[PDB]
From Swiss-Prot:
Changing S201F: Moderately reduces phosphatase activity. Interacts with CSK. Interacts with LPXN. Interacts with CBL. Interacts with TRAF3 (via MATH domain); the interaction promotes TRAF3 polyubiquitination. Belongs to the protein-tyrosine phosphatase family. Non-receptor class 4 subfamily. This is Tyrosine-protein phosphatase non-receptor type 22. The chain holds residues 1 to 302 of 807 of the full protein. The lineage of its organism: Eukaryota, Metazoa, Chordata, Craniata, Vertebrata. Expressed in bone marrow, B and T-cells, PBMCs, natural killer cells, monocytes, dendritic cells and neutrophils. Both isoform 1 and 4 are predominantly expressed in lymphoid tissues and cells. Isoform 1 is expressed in thymocytes and both mature B and T-cells. The gene is PTPN22. Keywords: Autophagy, Cytoplasm, Diabetes mellitus, Disease variant, Disulfide bond, Hydrolase, Immunity, Lipid metabolism, Phosphoprotein, Protein phosphatase, Systemic lupus erythematosus. Phosphorylation on Ser-35 by PKC/PRKCD abrogates its ability to dephosphorylate and inactivate the SRC family kinases. It comes from Homo sapiens (Human).
């Protein structure tokens, strides 16, 4: 309705902004400061994640899910399964459980990872990194390749029916069997995240998101996103996808702000978007999406 006007102002605001890598640096440091500081002593409790019984379930002791938005596990399998998993729900355009931001599972949380996927009827899983990347092991293998022996985590058995190789990522069609029941989960595994360069990664990442949305158009079930900590690249994708949903729904608000969007997501999952480069990526991706939506508006104009 008023989108053309709103988008245009945002577009003019950018093609008339010094926008230095310094402004980004200052702006991002400022975001980290105001999102984490100036709180009350008891702000953002993370007691469950800090419980003696759950301490070993966290990949990074400094990255703990907030109690209020943590993904609670009620699906019981063995008699040593708690409701805890390092993950938080992130609100989407249509629902409060549009995304699940979680850490890359540990050898001790592989069962919990699948408990979560099953309990919440997740269809799409987006892994934002290769298992082994830049000299580090990002997370434990919770999937299998075609022809490999099925994997078993507690009562769950996982196998891979097919695998589609694309330009910057691959798509695995996983089959998971629980209590005589079998579901299909589509795992998008991004395997070409740019070293130090966002300009070159905008299009491939938008391609990923476009592809994912061909499978799921709304927030009816949670889309699970992760890599290692469940914060950096995880936040880049949630922020970009969320923004795209606003654009497609024609609901971008006036004075839309990437700074504010990230702070808004940081209230649901700590440390969402960890580096300045990742921040710039979200900013640049959003601008490109604003331009693409403008092309859509103009093309449809009768």
């Amino acid at each position: 309705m008023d989108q053309r006007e709103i988008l245009q102002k945002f577009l003019d605001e950018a093609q008339s902004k010094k926008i230095t890598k310094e402004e980004f640096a200052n702006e991002f440091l400022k975001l980290k400061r105001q999102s984490t500081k100036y709180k009350a002593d008891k702000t953002y409790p993370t007691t469950v994640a800090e419980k003696p019984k759950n301490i070993k379930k966290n990949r990074y002791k400094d990255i703990l899910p907030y109690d209020y938005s943590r993904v609670e596990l009620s699906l019981i399998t063995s008699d040593e399964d708690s409701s805890y998993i390092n993950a938080n729900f992130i609100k989407g355009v249509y629902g409060p459980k549009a995304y699940i931001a979680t850490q890359g599972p540990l050898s001790t949380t592989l069962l919990d990872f699948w408990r979560m996927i099953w309990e919440y009827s997740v269809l799409i899983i987006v892994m934002a990194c290769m298992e082994y990347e830049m000299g580090k092991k990002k997370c434990e293998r919770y999937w299998a390749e075609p022809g490999e022996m099925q994997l078993e985590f507690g009562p769950f058995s996982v196998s891979c029916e097919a695998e589609k190789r694309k330009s910057d990522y691959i798509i695995r069609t996983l089959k998971v069997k629980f209590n005589s029941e079998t579901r299909t989960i589509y795992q998008f595994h991004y395997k070409n995240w740019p070293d130090h360069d966002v300009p070159s990664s905008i299009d491939p990442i938008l391609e990923l998101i476009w592809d994912v949305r061909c499978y799921q158009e709304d927030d009816s079930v949670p889309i699970c996103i992760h890599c290692s900590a469940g914060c950096g690249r995880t936040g880049v994708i949630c922020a970009i996808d969320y923004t795209w949903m606003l654009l497609k729904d024609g609901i971008i608000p006036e004075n839309f702000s990437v700074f504010s969007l990230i702070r808004e997501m940081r209230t649901q999952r700590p440390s969402l978007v960890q580096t300045q480069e990742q921040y710039e990526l979200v900013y640049n991706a959003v601008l490109e999406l604003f331009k693409r939506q403008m092309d859509v508006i103009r093309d449809k104009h009768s």
